[PDB]
Amino acid sequence: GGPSVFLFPPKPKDTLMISRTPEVTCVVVDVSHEDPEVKFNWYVDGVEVHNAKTKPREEQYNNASRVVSVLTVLHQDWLNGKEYKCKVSNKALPAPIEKTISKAKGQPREPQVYTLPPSRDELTKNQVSLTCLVKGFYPSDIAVEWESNGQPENNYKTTPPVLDSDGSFFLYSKLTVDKSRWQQGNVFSCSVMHEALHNHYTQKSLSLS
Amino acid sequence: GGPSVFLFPPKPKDTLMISRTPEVTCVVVDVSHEDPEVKFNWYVDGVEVHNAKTKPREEQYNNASRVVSVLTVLHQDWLNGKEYKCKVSNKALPAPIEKTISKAKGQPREPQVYTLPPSRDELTKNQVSLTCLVKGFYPSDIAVEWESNGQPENNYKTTPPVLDSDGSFFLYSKLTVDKSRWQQGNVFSCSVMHEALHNHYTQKSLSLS
Ligand SMILES: *[C@@H]1O[C@H](CO)[C@@H](O[C@@H]2O[C@H](CO)[C@@H](O)[C@H](O)[C@H]2NC(C)=O)[C@H](O)[C@H]1NC(C)=O
Ligand SMILES: *[C@@H]1O[C@H](CO)[C@@H](O[C@@H]2O[C@H](CO)[C@@H](O)[C@H](O)[C@H]2NC(C)=O)[C@H](O)[C@H]1NC(C)=O
């Protein structure tokens, strides 16, 4: 017994590209049956708005319900620091629950992007690691991708952002390719999207030296 | 109203060095005042043991209490996969809460450790990044450190372990030094501790080529 509220920011890639649709998501869990109806009020910088959409009710595994409201946001509103408030009114609540999110505050800093070839030690293995170091960025909302000849690469993993000692963030992205592709002289690229880059996008290349 | 239980494994460095003292920690939060007393029963592979120690009661910020029991463990017991069960008996509980932890199961895999010098692009900055790539290890319990001339370095950060595509883990550790120290020819070392290394320890060096 007891309903709670979680509020999620848009996905980094979505806020950075005008072609994409950034959304903020209000998730209500433990919806007491005795009180199913949930009213959502949305506010952007205090001003109530209405372009939200409540997706189908989902059935939890505890005799309770999950109701999700999704609010489409303007890229520029999000990047400019506007606050999004989701107001959840229920009967099983002493008062409406109000949650709030916004972009992290603080001076945006531009990611420095560095590509690092495999250690000579790794050339004895069947596959090698190509490393993309992304550092010095703020806020931590970022997306990183790898590609070669214009097509996405499958076998890569990216660390979460890590808080660095100067208050900015860094991460690494590791791409794994067969040693044969590397040694031939194939060219690989690390793409980085972040608000503090020109056109929200930079890429750095890496191939055999 | 309602008491819960969290169970924490020992610290990686502690299980790997015989000189250190690995402990498992049973944390009880929301200790209903009406029922303060908490009895701890500890079990190692089902066998009850008694070398635990209950640290001073702490006062939460919700009219409830926090009681912590700490169990000293044998390095080899932990690394061999023995299960640690913490049994919390309280009056405000329908039944004693039993929680359980053990080392992650699965074939231990040896970390491959690779040191990577700064990208040539970074030599235009006042400080440079020295990168230690640690990959292919299992389980994810690991510790990484940096040093030069036998002394620990201050300015480094290590990513959490990341699940790689073959089911093993990797991480990176980034050491930041003034460009001047790098270019002079100072030698830096990345130390790695993990159960699947000989003597639970390896290190790799990195200096100007
Ligand atoms: C699922 O939750 C509902 C409440 O949301 C439980 O229902 C109530 O059951 C009590 C009997 O103990 C009745 O007095 C209430 O009037 C019921 N309320 C409603 C809205 O039906 C129900 O018992 C729960 N299901 C299970 C299997 O435990
Ligand atoms: C802190 O928690 C205690 C219970 O752990 C609360 O105490 C009880 O208060 C009710 C009155 O509403 C009494 O009928 C009970 O007998 C009390 N129990 C005990 C063990 O004292 C107490 O009210 C809480 N403190 C605050 C400030 O809310």
Side-chain angles (χ1 to χ4, degrees):
Chain A
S4 49
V5 182
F6 298 83
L7 195 44
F8 293 94
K11 261 112 214 169
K13 231 178 133 164
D14 295 347
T15 71
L16 292 176
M17 291 189 45
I18 200 54
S19 65
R20 301 179 70 99
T21 315
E23 319 180 302
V24 49
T25 305
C26 201
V27 172
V28 192
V29 297
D30 299 336
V31 175
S32 87
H33 272 302
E34 184 89 348
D35 303 293
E37 293 177 350
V38 172
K39 293 179 179 179
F40 292 95
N41 286 101
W42 285 94
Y43 304 88
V44 183
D45 268 10
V47 196
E48 173 157 22
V49 306
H50 302 269
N51 46 322
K53 190 49 179 53
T54 307
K55 53 192 279 188
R57 191 182 224 90
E58 258 177 290
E59 182 64 36
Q60 291 183 193
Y61 287 173
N62 56 316
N63 199 22
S65 199
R66 191 169 63 196
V67 190
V68 180
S69 176
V70 179
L71 179 74
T72 293
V73 304
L74 299 183
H75 309 64
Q76 225 36 239
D77 281 354
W78 175 265
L79 297 172
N80 278 343
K82 293 196 177 181
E83 171 199 84
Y84 292 79
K85 185 196 303 182
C86 171
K87 196 183 202 294
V88 180
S89 299
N90 183 240
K91 299 227 151 34
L93 277 175
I97 294 190
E98 288 194 353
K99 291 301 202 184
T100 266
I101 58 172
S102 71
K103 195 184 72 162
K105 293 189 185 201
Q107 174 156 2
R109 290 194 45 201
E110 166 187 340
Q112 314 156 29
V113 183
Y114 303 114
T115 57
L116 316 181
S119 161
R120 131 154 284 176
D121 298 12
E122 207 180 18
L123 306 169
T124 71
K125 332 295 282 175
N126 297 129
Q127 290 177 321
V128 301
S129 313
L130 310 188
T131 290
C132 185
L133 162 64
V134 187
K135 64 162 285 188
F137 60 94
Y138 192 91
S140 60
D141 319 305
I142 196 161
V144 183
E145 287 173 15
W146 279 99
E147 67 168 55
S148 183
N149 289 336
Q151 280 233 339
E153 294 269 335
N154 18 278
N155 199 19
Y156 71 88
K157 302 280 179 151
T158 298
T159 74
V162 172
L163 182 64
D164 211 337
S165 45
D166 65 6
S168 69
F169 289 87
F170 73 93
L171 60 68
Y172 287 85
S173 182
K174 176 170 68 64
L175 168 63
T176 299
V177 305
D178 298 335
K179 183 170 66 188
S180 62
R181 309 183 54 205
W182 171 248
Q183 283 174 343
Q184 282 161 7
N186 286 296
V187 177
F188 301 84
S189 285
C190 173
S191 283
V192 172
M193 307 160 62
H194 194 269
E195 73 164 276
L197 293 167
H198 185 214
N199 285 323
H200 294 163
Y201 182 89
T202 190
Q203 82 172 31
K204 290 290 136 53
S205 297
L206 173 80
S207 65
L208 212 332
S209 196
Chain B
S4 49
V5 182
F6 298 83
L7 195 44
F8 293 94
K11 261 112 214 169
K13 231 178 133 164
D14 295 347
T15 71
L16 292 176
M17 291 189 45
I18 200 54
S19 65
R20 301 179 70 99
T21 315
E23 319 180 302
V24 49
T25 305
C26 201
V27 172
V28 192
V29 297
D30 299 336
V31 175
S32 87
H33 272 302
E34 184 89 348
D35 303 293
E37 293 177 350
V38 172
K39 293 179 179 179
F40 292 95
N41 286 101
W42 285 94
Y43 304 88
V44 183
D45 268 10
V47 196
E48 173 157 22
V49 306
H50 302 269
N51 46 322
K53 190 49 179 53
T54 307
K55 53 192 279 188
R57 191 182 224 90
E58 258 177 290
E59 182 64 36
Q60 291 183 193
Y61 287 173
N62 56 316
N63 199 22
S65 199
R66 191 169 63 196
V67 190
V68 180
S69 176
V70 179
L71 179 74
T72 293
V73 304
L74 299 183
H75 309 64
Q76 225 36 239
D77 281 354
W78 175 265
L79 297 172
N80 278 343
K82 293 196 177 181
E83 171 199 84
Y84 292 79
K85 185 196 303 182
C86 171
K87 196 183 202 294
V88 180
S89 299
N90 183 240
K91 299 227 151 34
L93 277 175
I97 294 190
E98 288 194 353
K99 291 301 202 184
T100 266
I101 58 172
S102 71
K103 195 184 72 162
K105 293 189 185 201
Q107 174 156 2
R109 290 194 45 201
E110 166 187 340
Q112 314 156 29
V113 183
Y114 303 114
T115 57
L116 316 181
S119 161
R120 131 154 284 176
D121 298 12
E122 207 180 18
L123 306 169
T124 71
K125 332 295 282 175
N126 297 129
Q127 290 177 321
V128 301
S129 313
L130 310 188
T131 290
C132 185
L133 162 64
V134 187
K135 64 162 285 188
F137 60 94
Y138 192 91
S140 60
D141 319 305
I142 196 161
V144 183
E145 287 173 15
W146 279 99
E147 67 168 55
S148 183
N149 289 336
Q151 280 233 339
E153 294 269 335
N154 18 278
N155 199 19
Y156 71 88
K157 302 280 179 151
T158 298
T159 74
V162 172
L163 182 64
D164 211 337
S165 45
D166 65 6
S168 69
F169 289 87
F170 73 93
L171 60 68
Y172 287 85
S173 182
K174 176 170 68 64
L175 168 63
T176 299
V177 305
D178 298 335
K179 183 170 66 188
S180 62
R181 309 183 54 205
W182 171 248
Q183 283 174 343
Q184 282 161 7
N186 286 296
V187 177
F188 301 84
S189 285
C190 173
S191 283
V192 172
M193 307 160 62
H194 194 269
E195 73 164 276
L197 293 167
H198 185 214
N199 285 323
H200 294 163
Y201 182 89
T202 190
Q203 82 172 31
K204 290 290 136 53
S205 297
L206 173 80
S207 65
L208 212 332
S209 196

